[PDB]
């Protein structure tokens, strides 16, 4: 017999044909999938009186459990079944309501922002509804749907109720961001942006995807704060961190200016670092869960030896600050001392007038002041061997994976910013953001500048050719520029940064898949010219989009502080050693763009930055950012079961892919990063990778660690993010 309990409470009887038809529907177009196998595995779990939702979840999981590299299409079988279940759970039926009826209901419920009904008429919502293709819900993989269900779709946390589907998410994000546009272009932009995101060509960050269309205005996820050498600034910095981490932001903190232990502030940097750490974790579950920061200091700081070991799990508590990451700032001079086997002299920034500023802004002035202060016997100093200091840094980098490098000279000689006016003196949490800052003397200091950046990414696997990036850059740049005027600003100094410079950070995902389908690899130099061509196109079209936006709406108030304003382009200032590793010519008219930028300006002081991805790439079934995948199948733990995702087009490209640990070394990847950096406005979250089993006695030599560090510098790499060590 087998009775089934409906959503109302009544007991109907089991319809095996109806289940079979839904599975048949979900199987359309898929290969190597067995419907009977899914039926056998789920139907054995059915019991008399099982409720309808449980039958749905049982067959979804049944399909999900069969995801493998041999049968990847189970990814899409499970997703479609999950999508079907999500439709009923939200709408009571497969077919979604009319957009207008949906929006009115959701505003009534207080789940959508009422500005939507003010800004658009019923007839415009009717028109927007014609743009929507709800069948694009069938293009998500299972891992994608899980991400949408848990993080993206508007829902009730307490009751578990889901209120929308993915195409309503996409259309309304588009509608909100383009809402202030004139009626002649408005719905044209809405339609094209909708198409771009719903077909995975553009990826948006989680705060946008989850919050844009809702009553929230908290969308800032990336904040850069510079601390001055005063209690007033330390207190302002801490206060600003607390406000931002309560809104879920990642933090980059520059604390390099704080004077060393024993200075005539007597007690040193570490107690203040501890206070920054507690600010960072002030809105976290149990001292860890939530809130994250990376803190920056120069390699020559007097306390550096103590600072390097702050996350070493074997030490005394008053000399450990383990729950922040760290970025060590280095320039040519430091590296030269390493090569020559000489000393590096350590100074407190308070003792060395102009040294700190020159470190970022002027390498000639740095060397003049450094050697001058080295000779001066009245200046407090400590001398250490360069080989020893570098080894300590790299030891801690290797053991934690979270001691980062910033080449501050590269960040300022090859930069959208004039370092005499607006130097880049730190980075963010993930080491791809590179923006000017100014210390605050109070939380509400109007003369301070906290850097903010709004992110997105192009899906390199979803474009058929590079000229498609013209339209996509227009959509991406305009959508994010609109977000800047839309979002809230809890701290005046951060609003100053965002409104003054209008900084954007648009990157990529699916790079590994992109190389695979072009038959290229990371490790052998085969992707060098393709990478050069690709990132020329990205930067060219991003600049063109922002240049055109400036013609239309005006350049950013602080455009005059950019190298762009002076008619200087990234193609003039790149690390010249790149000329030896790629011969690819420029394919776009940069000379015309140069004059057009100098005349009409840019709406946005920066446009590009290469961030890591996880959530965004999962939703598009893309490889993560610019990274090669570790394996063909990704695994994540879930309450709903083991979540698997197979790399895109494994069936045809498994041999074309180069997995992370199949790389013999870091050289090839680092050359690719250098080539990208020629064009990128900010930086790149570049990883280094080491497999102990590739080395004699199973231990990674310091020689190689330093060699790769030096290779990175030589090719103009601005930052180094995670060091990954293969376990085993």
């Amino acid at each position: 017999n087998l009775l089934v309990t409906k959503r109302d409470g009544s007991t109907e009887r089991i319809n095996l044909d109806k289940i079979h038809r839904v599975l048949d529907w979900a199987a359309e177009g898929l290969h190597n999938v067995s419907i009977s196998q899914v039926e056998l595995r789920s139907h054995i779990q059915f019991y008399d009186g099982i409720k309808t939702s449980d039958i749905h979840e049982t067959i979804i999981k049944a399909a999900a459990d069969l995801i493998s590299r041999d049968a990847p299409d189970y990814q899409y079988l499970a997703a479609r079944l999950a999508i079907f279940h999500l439709r009923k759970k939200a709408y009571g039926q497969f077919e979604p309501p009319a957009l207008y009826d949906h929006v009115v209901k959701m505003v009534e419920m207080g789940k959508y922002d009422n500005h939507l009904l003010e800004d658009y008429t019923e007839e415009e919502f009717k028109q927007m509804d014609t743009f929507i293709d709800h069948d694009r819900d069938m293009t998500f993989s299972y891992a994608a749907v899980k991400q949408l269900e848990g993080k993206y779709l508007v829902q009730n946390r307490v009751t578990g109720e889901i209120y929308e589907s993915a195409q309503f998410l996409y259309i309304l994000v588009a509608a909100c961001l383009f809402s202030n546009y004139p009626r002649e272009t408005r719905l044209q932009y809405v339609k094209r942006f909708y198409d771009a995101v719903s077909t995975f060509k553009i990826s948006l960050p989680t705060p946008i995807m989850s919050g844009v269309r809702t009553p929230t205005r908290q969308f800032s996820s990336c904040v850069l704060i510079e601390c001055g050498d005063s209690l007033d600034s330390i207190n302002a910095t801490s206060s600003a961190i607390v406000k931002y981490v309560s809104q879920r932001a990642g933090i980059g903190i520059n604390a390099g200016r704080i004077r060393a232990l024993g200075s005539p502030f007597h007690t040193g940097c570490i107690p203040f670092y501890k206070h920054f750490q507690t600010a960072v974790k002030s809105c976290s579950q149990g001292g860890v869960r939530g809130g994250a920061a990376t803190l920056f200091y120069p390699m020559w700081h007097l306390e550096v030896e103590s600072l390097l070991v702050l996350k070493n799990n074997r030490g005394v508590e008053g000399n450990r600050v383990r729950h922040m990451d760290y970025g060590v700032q280095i320039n040519k001079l430091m590296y030269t001392r390493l090569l020559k086997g000489e000393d590096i002299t350590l100074f407190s920034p308070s003792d060395v007038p102009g040294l700190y500023d020159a470190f970022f802004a002027d390498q000639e002035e740095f060397e003049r002041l450094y050697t001058k202060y080295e000779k001066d016997d009245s200046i407090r100093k400590q001398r250490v061997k360069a080989v020893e200091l570098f080894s300590l840094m790299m030891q801690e980098r290797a053991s934690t994976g979270r001691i980062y490098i910033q080449n501050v000279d590269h960040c300022n000689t090859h930069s959208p910013f004039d370092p005499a006016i607006a130097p880049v003196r730190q980075s963010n949490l993930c080491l791809e953001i590179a923006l000017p800052t100014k210390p605050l003397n109070d939380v509400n200091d109007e003369n301070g500048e906290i850097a903010l950046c709004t992110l997105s990414a192009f899906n390199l696997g979803a474009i058929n050719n590079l000229d498609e990036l013209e339209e996509l850059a227009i959509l991406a740049v305009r959508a994010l520029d609109a977000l800047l005027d839309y979002q809230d600003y809890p701290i005046p100094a951060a609003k100053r940064g965002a409104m003054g410079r209008r900084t954007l950070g648009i990157g990529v995902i699916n790079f590994a898949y992109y190389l695979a389908k072009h038959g290229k690899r990371y490790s052998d130099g085969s992707a060098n010219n393709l990478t050069h061509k690709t990132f020329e196109a990205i930067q060219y079209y991003l600049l063109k989009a922002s240049n055109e936006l400036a013609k239309e709406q005006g350049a950013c108030p602080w455009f005059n502080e950019t190298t762009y304003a002076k008619g200087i382009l990234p193609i003039d200032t790149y690390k010249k050693d790149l000329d030896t590793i790629a011969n690819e010519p420029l394919h776009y008219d940069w000379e015309a763009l140069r004059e057009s930028i100098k005349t009409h300006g840019l709406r946005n002081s920066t446009l590009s930055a290469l961030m890591p991805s996880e959530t965004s790439s999962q939703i598009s079934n893309a490889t993560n950012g610019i990274e090669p995948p570790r394996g063909y199948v990704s695994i994540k733990a879930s309450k709903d079961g083991i979540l698997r995702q197979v790399v895109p087009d494994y069936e045809h490209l498994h041999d074309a892919y180069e997995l992370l640990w199949e790389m013999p070394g870091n050289d090839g990847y680092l050359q690719l990063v250098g080539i990208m950096q020629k064009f990128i406005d900010q930086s790149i979250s570049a990883n280094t990778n080491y497999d102990p089993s590739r080395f004699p006695s199973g231990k990674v030599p310091m020689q190689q660690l330093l060699k790769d560090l030096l290779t990175a510098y030589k090719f103009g790499v601005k930052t180094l993010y995670y060091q990954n060590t293969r376990d085993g």
């Binding site: 080894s391 790299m394 231990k699 030599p701 310091m702 030589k714």
Partner: peptide, 16 residues
């Protein structure tokens, strides 16, 4: 673990 062996003469060749 890591091998702490550093050849400074091997590095002295490199140009930044």
């Amino acid at each position: 673990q890591i091998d702490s062996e550093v050849d400074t003469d091997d590095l002295s060749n490199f140009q930044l």
